[PDB]
Amino acid sequence: NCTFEYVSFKNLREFVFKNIDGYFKIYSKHTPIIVREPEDLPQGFSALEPLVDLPIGINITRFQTLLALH
Amino acid sequence: LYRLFRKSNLKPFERDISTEIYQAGNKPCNGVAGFNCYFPLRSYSFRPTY
Ligand SMILES: *[C@@H]1O[C@H](CO)[C@@H](O[C@@H]2O[C@H](CO)[C@@H](O[C@@H]3O[C@H](CO[C@H]4O[C@H](CO)[C@@H](O)[C@H](O)[C@@H]4O)[C@@H](O)[C@H](O[C@H]4O[C@H](CO)[C@@H](O)[C@H](O)[C@@H]4O)[C@@H]3O)[C@H](O)[C@H]2NC(C)=O)[C@H](O)[C@H]1NC(C)=O
């Protein structure tokens, strides 16, 4: 079901996925950090504004990420 | 078609569209329909004379 379709090192992306009562809530924040060592998360405070609310109603216990390769 | 058997009760505002055979008995069905392996979806056959 393709129900929802939307078209809108130097970059850190933070997301929170939260599945409550059949609602998938995605909070997001993008920040342009400059850090020499990417071995650790940077020290600081970033507030995550809410982005996406989906009434999918599915049951989730596992997840995986997608990569772009050539 | 109405569901009659489930492993557990659903969470609110959730759906389960899988039509797999439930293990009604302790014997494993393993994809075989039979006794103690009842199909979950059963219709009611609605008639105006009921
Ligand atoms: C969303 O989707 C997930 C996954 O698809 C569902 O997760 C289920 O989670 C339960 C609990 O983890 C799984 O139940 C397992 O059942 C095995 C068989 O036990 C049968 O008999 C007992 C009575 O003795 C019944 O209660 C049970 O329902 C079975 O009929 C057990 O052997 C398992 O125990 C093992 O794992 C637990 C940890 O979970 C250990 O503590 C134990 O020591 C043992 O190693 C376990 O109890 C069930 O199989 C999962 N379902 C699926 C499809 O994988 C969620 O339920 C679902 N959400 C909703 C709302 O439905």
Q: Who's near B13: CB < 8 A, 6+ residues apart? A: A21, A22, A23, A55, A57
CA atoms within 13 A on the CB side of A26: 10
Query: Distance between terminal CA atoms of chain B?
Result: 18
Q: Are A23 and A53 in contact (CB under 8 A)?
A: yes
Whether B13 and A22 lie within 8 Å, measured CB to CB: yes
Taking alpha carbons only, the member of A42, A39, A14, A41 closest to residue A28 is A14
CB A30, CB A11: distance < 8 Å: yes
What are φ and ψ of residue A60, in 5° steps? -120, 130
Q: Which residues of B touch A1 (CB under 8 A)?
A: none
- For residue A64, the distance in angstroms to the closest alpha carbon of chain B comes to 22
Rounded-to-integer distance, Cα B28 and Cα B41, Å: 19
Q: What is the resolution of this structure in A?
A: 3.4
